[PDB]
Amino acid sequence: APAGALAAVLKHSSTLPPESTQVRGYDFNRGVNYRALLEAFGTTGFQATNFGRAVQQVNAMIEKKLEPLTSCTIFLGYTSNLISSGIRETIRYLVQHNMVDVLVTTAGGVEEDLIKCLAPTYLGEFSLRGKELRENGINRIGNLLVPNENYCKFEDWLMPILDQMVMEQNTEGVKWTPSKMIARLGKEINNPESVYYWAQKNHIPVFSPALTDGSLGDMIFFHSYKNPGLVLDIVEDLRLINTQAIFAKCTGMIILGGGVVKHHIANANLMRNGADYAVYINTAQEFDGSDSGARPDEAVSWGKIRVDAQPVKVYADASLVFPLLVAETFAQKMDAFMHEKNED
Amino acid sequence: APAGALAAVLKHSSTLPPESTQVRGYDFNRGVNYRALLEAFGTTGFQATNFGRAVQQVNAMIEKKLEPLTSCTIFLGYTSNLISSGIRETIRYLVQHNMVDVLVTTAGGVEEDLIKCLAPTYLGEFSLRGKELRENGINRIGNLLVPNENYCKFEDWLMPILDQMVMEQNTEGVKWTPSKMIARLGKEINNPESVYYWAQKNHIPVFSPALTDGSLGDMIFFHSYKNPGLVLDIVEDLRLINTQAIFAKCTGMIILGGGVVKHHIANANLMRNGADYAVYINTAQEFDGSDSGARPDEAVSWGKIRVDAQPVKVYADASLVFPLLVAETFAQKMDAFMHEKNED
Amino acid sequence: APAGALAAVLKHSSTLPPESTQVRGYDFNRGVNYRALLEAFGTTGFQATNFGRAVQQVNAMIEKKLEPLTSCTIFLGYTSNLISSGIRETIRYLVQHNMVDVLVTTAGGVEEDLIKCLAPTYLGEFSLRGKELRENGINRIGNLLVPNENYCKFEDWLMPILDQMVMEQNTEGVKWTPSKMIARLGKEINNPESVYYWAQKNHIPVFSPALTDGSLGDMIFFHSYKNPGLVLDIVEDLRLINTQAIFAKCTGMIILGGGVVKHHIANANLMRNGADYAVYINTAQEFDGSDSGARPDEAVSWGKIRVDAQPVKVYADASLVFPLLVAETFAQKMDAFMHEKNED
Amino acid sequence: APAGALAAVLKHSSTLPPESTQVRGYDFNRGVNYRALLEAFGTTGFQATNFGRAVQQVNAMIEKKLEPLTSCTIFLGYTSNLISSGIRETIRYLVQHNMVDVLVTTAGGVEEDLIKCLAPTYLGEFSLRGKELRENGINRIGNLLVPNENYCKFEDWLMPILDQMVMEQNTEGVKWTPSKMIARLGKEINNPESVYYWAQKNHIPVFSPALTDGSLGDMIFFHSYKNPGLVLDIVEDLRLINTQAIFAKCTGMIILGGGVVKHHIANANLMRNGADYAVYINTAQEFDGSDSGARPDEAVSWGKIRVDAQPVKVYADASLVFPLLVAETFAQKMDAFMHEKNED
Numbered sequence A, B, C, D: 001a002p003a004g005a006l007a008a009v010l011k012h013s014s015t016l017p018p019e020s021t022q023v024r025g026y027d028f029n030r031g032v033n034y035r036a037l038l039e040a041f042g043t044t045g046f047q048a049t050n051f052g053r054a055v056q057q058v059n060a061m062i063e064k065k066l067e068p069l070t071s072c073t074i075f076l077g078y079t080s081n082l083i084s085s086g087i088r089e090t091i092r093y094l095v096q097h098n099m100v101d102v103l104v105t106t107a108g109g110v111e112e113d114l115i116k117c118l119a120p121t122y123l124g125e126f127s128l129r130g131k132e133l134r135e136n137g138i139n140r141i142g143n144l145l146v147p148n149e150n151y152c153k154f155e156d157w158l159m160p161i162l163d164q165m166v167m168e169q170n171t172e173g174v175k176w177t178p179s180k181m182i183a184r185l186g187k188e189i190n191n192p193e194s195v196y197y198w199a200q201k202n203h204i205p206v207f208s209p210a211l212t213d214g215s216l217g218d219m220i221f222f223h224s225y226k227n228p229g230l231v232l233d234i235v236e237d238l239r240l241i242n243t244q245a246i247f248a249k250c251t252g253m254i255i256l257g258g259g260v261v262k263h264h265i266a267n268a269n270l271m272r273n274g275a276d277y278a279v280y281i282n283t284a285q286e287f288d289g290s291d292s293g294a295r296p297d298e299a300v301s302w303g304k305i306r307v308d309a310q311p312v313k314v315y316a317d318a319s320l321v322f323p324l325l326v327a328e329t330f331a332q333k334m335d336a337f338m339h340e341k342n343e344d
């Protein structure tokens, strides 16, 4: 056999350091121990290992936090489609129990939480044809369906609030911004199933720099005809979110998806020279040079994540991953959170 | 041989309709006829066929347009990373020659066009480690590099302009919005290599609902300490972009990337019950239910693309695709555009 | 407000049919009921809903099966990297308990199961540089590491077996094929942690048309110098796998990943005019026209999946998804499987 | 303004080294100079820059080659769907003019080249429903269509050849392997539009370890009933491809797509301790730990690409990219290739 071929293929290797962990998956001969099955993800490899790390990182944020400021300010960011899905429930649970500090989402992420209190969203199919659905006034969101009557109901609900918002702006001197508006709609919806109802109630601010890119925008638009003058300033909200990072004792970032939401949170944390913890769950890829698809390491070069931080990115659909992450982290510390509130 | 196996595998088929086109790629035995090679993409299959269709669709927008209003209002949308790349040149060419009507981009998409007039962006690698780059103050964007000194220069350049913007707001009654600001910075940069210099000059509006999510935002933030009060209203800009769709004789949408940009343009066109032409070039996928990754058909269900329109989506990095699309469309009609301006 | 704008945006919609299911995620206020949390994936939307469907489809295969033939022949296919990961354990569990009928994997999928009985694979990082690792003789597989000494040990282990295989071929008339070889190596490894040890023991055939594309191939190659003549025929294995589909009472397909494995299983089922059940878990996309990235519906056009079947594709990394699918399906029916074997 | 905030954001940076290249895209004010537009991809960034590098790397392989052995043995690998597309023409052009040395493809990649000489493939849509198409006996491949009558014609064409192949095996002692078979079918098809007709004619071997995974396999299967005994050995083909790498003066790898094809070529080059040049064009991602989605650097850790080589991976659909790469490389050196053959 060719010598060089043998040498190339049969190259010797010294052993790895003792610290090395072996790949090993959950053994179902033990039966189904869900906690152990989930912990086994850590040694399963690929994205399973990253999920395992995300659980450790989020648990570290929480532990730091349990040591109005807290020991660690957690920013929770998500894209609109996640509020359309059932992840809306998971997010509402975290906010209801004051487990995160700052929320930032896109317009869809705001409006659809309120609308779900008015009418439901349904399961559909990715394959459903647009023409046929439009003839029925049904809007398609992935494999989910939002009947357009939902937005008609949203309009009926919202208009009276916009009348009052412009009145208050003009007679009471109110300076409206996306966060102030979102807090208002949250108080107005007055429904325990609402993310913003709870955020408003727990004084957790919600940032959304492009609040006008959606249904709420359409309503603001039409309403501006009979009642012109409403102003939504994005500058004041910039100061608010940035100062939360700046004066935080320590920060963690839990970001689902990419775009403005992801970038906006990481830019705020650059103001303090980087977040101390960062966990991402998104399906974007880096090859196109997009910010949305950038590995957490690129954020390190910008100084948005501390050079000594251990950021984790899980490549996967959050609808699948987020509830499992919450089950193994926040949900496992309910007593600790309550204890901090004097309820345990 | 098993009968049912034979029947299943050897199932007969009638012939396809005469209208059917055969798959066939460019024959290099002809040598290199670039125009024919590009036209051959149409019958090559997969994304090549979609690129071929995108060329036909954009050419249709242009032809309709050549028949202050024009016969077809073209909205050009792009994400920030594309202005970081050399596609910034392609976009500036289209705007310089008044070939598109409305532009919408994200914050990075605005600021980096101006900054490139102050200092350049360089080629780097996706692999460059964040820690090492940060120790040098180098920001990484995909396989591109933006030295942080660039933003320091941006700050020196921008501050005087922000002083004047707040002065004008307070003594001259100016109501600032993202588009008005972008037009101002474009006039200020006064450089022929600037996209916004040309947009401002050709009265092509630029929308950017989250103009604060970036460097310009950081500068607005810091500046607000010595000179507080600047207001950036996103509501008035909503009326402006929506009315462009509403009063357009016909519309076309050329969108690179996804996120707010893509959604914002399609929402404006819903105001006229859908765009007449739509071409997309992005790398997002639909499985995660994201708006960014939605096939053009989902937009049809919302009524953002006319049910009778033939939208085209090319799955590919625009840095590769866009210059070829411009070469085969707009660049092929320079004389026609000039003719409309009485220069031919 | 513009009339047509209002009409377009405020289009009415009738209600959806009563059969419609509402999107709703798990409510953590209930605490952590893992079974309910997993069942809630079904109404969470996006890939979570598809995972929910995959569980229902696999449970249907199993139920049909529990009604040497069985009521439903399940083909289990997987790519090499999944045997490198801890999913190797999940697969071995299914095979150990005779829960699937036919296995098909690539070369890596065969050899690495045997090698893990000789030396372990470790956790590494996607970021580890190739040059540095090669200087140490460490092979990188995603975020996993395979020290090259592992293959040296594999060679020491395999050579004696290859000597015997060629002897038997030449003096005992044995006609070697990939499946016969894999069964032999499985018997030889004689380790309860081995997938092929169990397959061989439970008479579950393993197909691998390109068994030579890997380490086993390198060893076959070098060995052919001192002991030439070994023949591995891929034709006989074709008859074997095809006849399993043809004479099956009913079939189900559980495929992880794409490529040859996925295509080979679906082609065998075309021989019976399509599989009755099909569940896929892979991360491939359809835009490039690849077979690996084709939606299950394309398989329907070929007649590889029955037109009346309800195939499910989950877009996600199987290292994350497969153990959860097994927990909710096969692992929940251990007693039923044992009952069929007279052990309950 | 907060000091630490200013320090973090306004961090100074020294200038980059003089060797740094600036990002800059093609300026269409020059008109359309296709050669310059393509060369400009190099400084455009993202995948455009990688395409630019792929052109330089392939040109280096060719230059080395122009210095039966040649100075550089080029392995050309591609997946089946690319032969279904018009890229079949591009590949046939390279083979017709003896520009590559070894070809390796999957089963579909072999059979569909032959079938296209019998009947054409057509343009369809990704959206075409499987049920409807199957009722018509039309097979769907991405946005392409293959009428099933094509395979019926393939069967009529192939059977006589298989009768002879088994006759020759049994009376003339022929030992069949995938490469020997493919050479035979190539000679048999006797059509200048056939890739394998030209490969056979130019003595360019074609490897395909899973030649049975497709239509040719179905035909081999059915034929084995009346004429049993045909043997296709994959071991001898292993020696052939490996020795091409081993005894090559220098090697280059041009791989389109992933899977067996990609892995098989890189494994052969490991026999010589790595390929000297490597260019890849595929859409696979690394996150799932797949070999198909591995960055070229992982191949370096295995020693399949020389540690001192500059491999290039372009993330994009090859139907779009490959013809442009050939236009800028091989097609630009036709005279040089002919010169080496004494035709110039």
Ligand SMILES: NC(=O)c1ccc[n+]([C@@H]2O[C@H](COP(=O)([O-])OP(=O)(O)OC[C@H]3O[C@@H](n4cnc5c(N)ncnc54)[C@H](O)[C@@H]3O)[C@@H](O)[C@H]2O)c1
Residues within 6 Å of the ligand: A078, A079, A080, A081, A082, A084, A106, A107, A108, A109, A141, A210, A212, A213, A214, A215, A256, A257, A258, A259, A260, A261, A281, A282, A283, A284, A285, A292, A316, A317, A318, A319, B258, B259, B260, B263, B284, B288, B289, B290, B291, B292, B293, C046
């Ligand atoms: N998507 C909707 O349902 C919806 C509804 C109303 C308005 N909008 C508008 O669309 C704009 C853009 O949307 P976003 O909401 O900005 O971005 P998308 O455009 O919603 O998502 C951006 C990126 O986030 C990642 N992502 C999306 N869903 C994910 C998931 N399930 N798991 C993990 N990663 C995921 C993907 O990488 C994607 O490319 C919003 O600003 C909003 O104004 C969207």
Ligand SMILES: NC(=O)c1ccc[n+]([C@@H]2O[C@H](COP(=O)([O-])OP(=O)(O)OC[C@H]3O[C@@H](n4cnc5c(N)ncnc54)[C@H](O)[C@@H]3O)[C@@H](O)[C@H]2O)c1
Residues within 6 Å of the ligand: A258, A259, A260, A263, A284, A288, A289, A290, A291, A292, A293, B078, B079, B080, B081, B082, B084, B106, B107, B108, B109, B141, B210, B212, B213, B214, B215, B256, B257, B258, B259, B260, B261, B281, B282, B283, B284, B285, B292, B316, B317, B318, B319, D046
């Ligand atoms: N990316 C930057 O360089 C940069 C710079 C400054 C600020 N920002 C901020 O980041 C926010 C989010 O970015 P965007 O700019 O909103 O989105 P990304 O988050 O820039 O891109 C969103 C989606 O667009 C698609 N896309 C990206 N690049 C593409 C390409 N080359 N070809 C085709 N498709 C492509 C992808 O599917 C991607 O998931 C901006 O609003 C901005 O404020 C980004």
Ligand SMILES: NC(=O)c1ccc[n+]([C@@H]2O[C@H](COP(=O)([O-])OP(=O)(O)OC[C@H]3O[C@@H](n4cnc5c(N)ncnc54)[C@H](O)[C@@H]3O)[C@@H](O)[C@H]2O)c1
Residues within 6 Å of the ligand: A046, C078, C079, C080, C081, C082, C084, C106, C107, C108, C109, C141, C210, C212, C213, C214, C215, C256, C257, C258, C259, C260, C261, C281, C282, C283, C284, C285, C292, C316, C317, C318, C319, D258, D259, D260, D263, D284, D288, D289, D290, D291, D292, D293
């Ligand atoms: N990958 C390895 O570790 C390895 C080891 C030895 C040999 N090989 C050789 O490489 C060849 C090609 O590999 P395969 O093994 O054929 O294909 P890959 O090339 O292993 O995977 C092919 C496709 O499967 C899907 N996929 C991969 N991993 C996945 C995951 N974690 N979850 C879901 N989907 C996933 C992806 O869409 C991917 O593009 C094999 O035939 C084998 O001979 C590979």
Ligand SMILES: NC(=O)c1ccc[n+]([C@@H]2O[C@H](COP(=O)([O-])OP(=O)(O)OC[C@H]3O[C@@H](n4cnc5c(N)ncnc54)[C@H](O)[C@@H]3O)[C@@H](O)[C@H]2O)c1
Residues within 6 Å of the ligand: B046, C258, C259, C260, C263, C284, C288, C289, C290, C291, C292, C293, D078, D079, D080, D081, D082, D084, D106, D107, D108, D109, D141, D210, D212, D213, D214, D215, D256, D257, D258, D259, D260, D261, D281, D282, D283, D284, D285, D292, D316, D317, D318, D319
């Ligand atoms: N795809 C077909 O038309 C077809 C036809 C007959 C038989 N088959 C069988 O399917 C098996 C698997 O197919 P392959 O042919 O092995 O792999 P695919 O499974 O054809 O492709 C594998 C990977 O290659 C990459 N890829 C595919 N098309 C690409 C493109 N246009 N540009 C760049 N990258 C691309 C992708 O990352 C993909 O995940 C073959 O071995 C063959 O036996 C396929």
